[PDB]
Design a binder for these strands. Sequence first.
RNA 1: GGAUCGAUCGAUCGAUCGAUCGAUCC
Length: 682
Amino acid sequence: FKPRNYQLELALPAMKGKNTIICAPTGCGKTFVSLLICEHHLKKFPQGQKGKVVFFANQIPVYEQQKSVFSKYFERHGYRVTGISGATAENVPVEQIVENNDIIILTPQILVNNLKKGTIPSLSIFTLMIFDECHNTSKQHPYNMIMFNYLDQKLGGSSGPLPQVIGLTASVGVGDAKNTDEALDYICKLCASLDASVIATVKHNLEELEQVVYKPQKFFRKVESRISDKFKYIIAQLMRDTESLAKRICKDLENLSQIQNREFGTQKYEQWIVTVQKACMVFQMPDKDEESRICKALFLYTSHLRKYNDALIISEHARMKDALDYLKDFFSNVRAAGFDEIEQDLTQRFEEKLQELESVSRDPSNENPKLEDLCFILQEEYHLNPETITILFVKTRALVDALKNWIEGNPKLSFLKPGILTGRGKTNQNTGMTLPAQKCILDAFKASGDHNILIATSVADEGIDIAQCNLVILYEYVGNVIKMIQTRGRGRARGSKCFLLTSNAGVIEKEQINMYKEKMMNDSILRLQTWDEAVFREKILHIQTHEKFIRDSQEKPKPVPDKENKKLLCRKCKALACYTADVRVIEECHYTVLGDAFKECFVSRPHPKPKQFSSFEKRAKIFCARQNCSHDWGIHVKYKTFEIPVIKIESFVVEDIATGVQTLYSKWKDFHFEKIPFDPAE
RNA sequence: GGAUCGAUCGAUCGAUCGAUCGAUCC
Ligand SMILES: Nc1ncnc2c1ncn2[C@@H]1O[C@H](COP(=O)(O)OP(=O)(O)O)[C@@H](O)[C@H]1O
Ligand SMILES: [Mg+2]
Ligand SMILES: [Zn+2]
C-alpha cells in the first residue's frame, strides 16, 4: 500500500516526539497511519538500543486483526511482534514476553493486571504507546487506568524514559456538554488524560479524504404509533388480574414503592415491579414456614408481571405474534420447570385468553405502522438499487429475532436475507452468539454473499470490520454523539442513507442535539488547534495535577467490617443457604463456600459456555436444591485442583442472626463483613 | 464469578444512588 497524502499529514506530528490524539472518520485508514508511525519510531534509535512500542486493542476481534496486520507488515525488517490476551497469559510470564519482543498488541486489561500485581513496575520499558479507539478514556476504563499509572509515574518526581502516546480515535466526543465552552473543556480534559498536546486532523488534503470517506445523508422517519391496539387490552387485563391476585397476600402492595402513576408496557412500570420484588424479598415473618410461601408467591407474581410488561414492550415495537410467541415460550419454560398451584393458576388464566390473543394476532388489520414504513422504505431503496446492503440497528437483543422473523415472514419483501448479529452477551447465560459465529456472519455479509441485510445490536458501533453499506437504518436507536458518528461512518459508500425510524419526537430531538454537539466538537477542535503548544502543555499539566489531587484525595479507607455471624438465604425460596462464617475469598473478588453442609444445598447443571477468566475453569452451574426453586445461586469452578462453587450476593438475602433484619446487596463490594481469605488447606 | 462503558427510567437533595437493556474484557 502507498501512503496517501492525508495519511502522511496525520502521521507528521506523531513522527516528532510529541504525543498525538490523531482523529479521522471511519474508513480513513488510521491503521496504516499507526503502521507508519511505528516504522518511523523503530528506526530513530541508533546502534545499541531498540524500541518497545506497544499497541492497545480492547476487543478481541480487532486485537487479532491488528496483530495479523502488524505481523504481515513488520516481520520483514527484523522486529519481533507478539500479542497477549485472555487465552495467552494463563501461565506464560508476561515480563519475558515483553522483554523478548519489540511490538506487542496486548489488551489493556492484561497490562492493568500486570502493573497491579507484580509485573512491569514502571511503564518506562516501552518507548511508544498506541491506543486504538482512544476516545474510550473515561471514568474507569482500562485505558484510563494505564494513563493514571503513566501520570503517577510522570508527576511523581522519579520519572524516567516515559513512552509516547499515539492514541487514535474516530470521534473525540463532548460527553454531557451543552455549549462550546463545555465541549472545549471536555476536549482539554481528554487531551490531558492522554498527556498529549497535538490533535492531528486533515486540513490541507481534505479533497482526497472526501473521495473515500463519503458521508451519508440522514433522514428522519417520525411516524405515529398504533391507535387500535386490541393486543394491549387483553395483556393489561391479565396484568390487572395478576396484580389483584398479588394484593391478596400483600395488603400494603401500593406502599412498597414511591411510583405514583405507572402505565402498563413502559419502563416506569418495570422499575416499579422491580422495586416491589426487591421489597418483598426482605419480608420476614416469625414462622420461617409461612414467610417462605408468601415470598415465593410474590416472586412468581412479580415475575409474571415483568414478563407481561416485557411482552407489551415487544408488541409496541414488533408484531403482535412476536410478543405472543415470547409469552408462549415463557409459559412453556415455566411448565417444563416446577409446576406449583400458583403457576398452574397463572398458566390457566393465560390459556383462558390465549385463544383471543391468537385471533387478534392473526388479524392483519392491526399491523404496526412502524414496520409498514420500514417495509416501504426498504422496498423503495431496493427497487432504486437492487445491489444494496442494510445494517438495520435494533437496541434490543430480544427484538432482532422478531425483526428477522418479520422480514422472513413477509411476501412484500422477499429479496432480503437476514444476517442478524448480536454479540457474546452474558458470560453465564445461554444467550448471544459466539466469536466464530460472529466471524462467519461478518464474512458472509458482502455485496455478492448470501446475506444482504443484518439486524445488529450496538456491537456494530465500535471497532469492527463490516462491508461498506449504504442503507443504514436506526429502528428506535438513539445514543450519544460518539455512537452517532460511529454509526454514520459505517455507511461510507458512494452515496448512502442513514434513515432514522421512530414513533417518538424525543428520539428526533436527541438526534438533533447529537448533531449539534458534533458541530460543537468540530468547532472546539478547530479552536484548540490554533493555540500555542506551550500554553496548551501548561493547561494540560494543570488539569493533570488537579485530576491527580482529586484521585489521591478520594482514597476512602476500608471501614470496620461487621464481625458478626449472619446467614445467607435463597432470594426466591427464603431457605437457609449458608452462613457468612464459612465464606472464603479466593483472590479478593470471588467468594466460595466450604463445608459438607452446603454441598447438599445446591444442584449442578452443565454450563452452556465454559471458559477460564484468570485461573479458574467453569465446570458447571449451581441452582437451588429445593422442591421447585431453580434459582441461580452462582457457578462451579476449578481453582487449582478441587471443584468449588463460587456464589454471587445478588441472589442471596442477608439475615442477621442476633437482630433478625434482612438486607439485599447487588455486589460483594457493598457487603462489609469479616471476609476470610481462601486457604489451600481444609 | 468479577470489572468496565453507553443509552433509558425512578428516588433523594445541577449532584448522589437505584433499576432495565446493549456491548466489551479478565
Ligand atoms: N494506502 C492505502 N492503500 C490501499 N488501501 C488502504 C490504504 N489505507 C487503508 N486502506 C484500506 O482501508 C481500510 C481501512 O481500515 P483501517 O486502516 O483499520 O481504518 P478504519 O479503522 O477507519 O477502517 C483497510 O482495510 C485498508 O485495507
Ligand atoms: Mg482504528
Ligand atoms: Zn430456594
